[model samples]
Target: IVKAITFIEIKEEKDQSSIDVKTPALSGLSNKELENSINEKYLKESQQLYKEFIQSTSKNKKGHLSIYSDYETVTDTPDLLSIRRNIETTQASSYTQSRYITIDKKNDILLTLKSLFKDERYIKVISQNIKEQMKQQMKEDPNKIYWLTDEDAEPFKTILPDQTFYITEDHKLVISFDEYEVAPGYMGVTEFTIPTGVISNLLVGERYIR
Candidate 1:
């Protein structure tokens, strides 16, 4: 199973592979600073995880490239970079204290949260109570279909299910699970910026809000 979430530049099947994307700067920081900070923190953690996997699983391996989507989201506050870094620091410190995670892949987790914040139809659905209500009403009325964003189902398919899925119901973000196997999980509104590349690979169009 391909568990990694890649942010690659897409090309026609006949075209050669494109260059690797340079990750954007974190929320309020410069790109260079963000890259350096992420690498510094990630490398140390990666090394620890590599050792533990070898010790516990009997398989030793080198680290893998930690890729990030461009961090610039027009919807995200320009100042949120500092907030984002703080969020990172808090999560890291908590993890250190708890030791729930031995892997140093902070960048990976960061990128994942970043993806959650990436602007999408579902995100918009969860953002405003009025908008969510309109969505339901529109679903019930043909005229409302115009409000729908023209994306498809594949992205949701990739998000693993066993976790909580939040959705908009009756003008509020609600929780619902139809099954335990592989249902699409909805995240309550998130505030991070999502990378553009992941959206494209998932066949989602460029987000206008960003």
Candidate 2:
């Protein structure tokens, strides 16, 4: 499975220096709080640079770089990215909310492929397989594990799916999901919130933290 942390990296361009930004990871701190910390620690331009990094991230689709399927669902906060676009377009600061987003990376990938090909049964199978596989994986390896959303999925008004905001971190949301209706009563919007203690540790990587 593709772990969220797998996408975290720090890089530098030829002319520019190095800065650290957690891909798809927010510090859950507001801009003001971040500013205070930086000021106290003398990171005068950290905020500005971080903002630029965010813009670049959205514009280029860096990091995990996988788009969700048109028929996918965000039954939980972590699954939000699996179905949503622009999951990382948010400002950094104390106001920024963060979570330990868990996802069934494999299942979501399958869902995206099956949707693009318009496979109804594939969607359901993959969705169910996601949870089952994750459960098995966790039982085998708890040190690193991911799961699908806890959100409930329901049919929407559109043929594909409607957008719903899931996880809001650092004042930014882990945004909307794109899903389609399969059955009369089996499809609908899902509910999901951040799991407990998914956001801890301040390993900013190469990024300086105050």
Candidate 3:
């Protein structure tokens, strides 16, 4: 079994301050070697990313650089696990990025989009579903417009396994697109959830679903 603890700290002055170094502390899983390894890997990766942001602004003449790091657990099932992290860096311009990690606990390995289904059917299904969701959302409020064409929409075609996803408590798969990713920056982050009824048969490791 595993539990999560978060650590956050801020240091330095207003103009030159290093802000919000956040990380998770996992405990009660020392005997689970695979879990320990996964937790360590996540910690190292997050720390490295945060450090890179710090280095970029450590000596900048543009006053203070805003930085933040935080994470949330999306799924914690016996057979699957997923976590999402947000890293923000604000200097001359503001930018935010999301990182998602999913583990196939039974296999003791990372999970990918292709691994969830046979062939590449998941890709076409997910892409189509996301587009339909976006269209429906836009229909509700005509003010919102997504980049149906262009570079921002290109990433949708090659949806990475860890692009930004989580399996809900009820076994639904939810995918996220960061701000300015598939739509205008004003849309913030767009998410599409695929109910278990839609993809249950397509997904392997059916034990994970209710």
Give the winner by lDDT: 3
Candidate 1 stretches greater than 4 Å from native: 1-31, 57-210
**lDDT values for all models:** 0.27, 0.30, 0.67
Better of 1 and 3 by TM-score: 3
lDDT of 1 by residue, 146-210 (tens): 22343653222222222222211111112222221221222212221223332334322322222
RMSD of 3: 3.4
What is candidate 1's TM-score against the reference?
0.21
- Considering lDDT, where higher is better, how would the candidates rank from best to worst? 3, 2, 1
TM-score of 2: 0.22
How many collisions between residues are there in candidate 3? 0
Cand. 2 Cα-lDDT: 0.30
Which has the higher lDDT value, candidate number 1 or candidate number 3? 3
lDDT of 3 by residue, 52-142 (tens): 6567566665565777777888788776667777777776666677767666565666666566676667776777777777677778988
Model 2 worst lDDT run, 10 consecutive residues: 201-210
Instruction: State the lDDT of candidate 2 residue by residue for 1-210, as single tens digits.
Output: 122221233343322222344243222223445324423422223344455654555544434321111112233343223322221222221111122222233233212222222335433433443345445655786552332332454422222221233333222222223212222212222222322222112122211111
- Number of backbone-clashing residue pairs for each candidate, in the order shown: 3, 25, 0
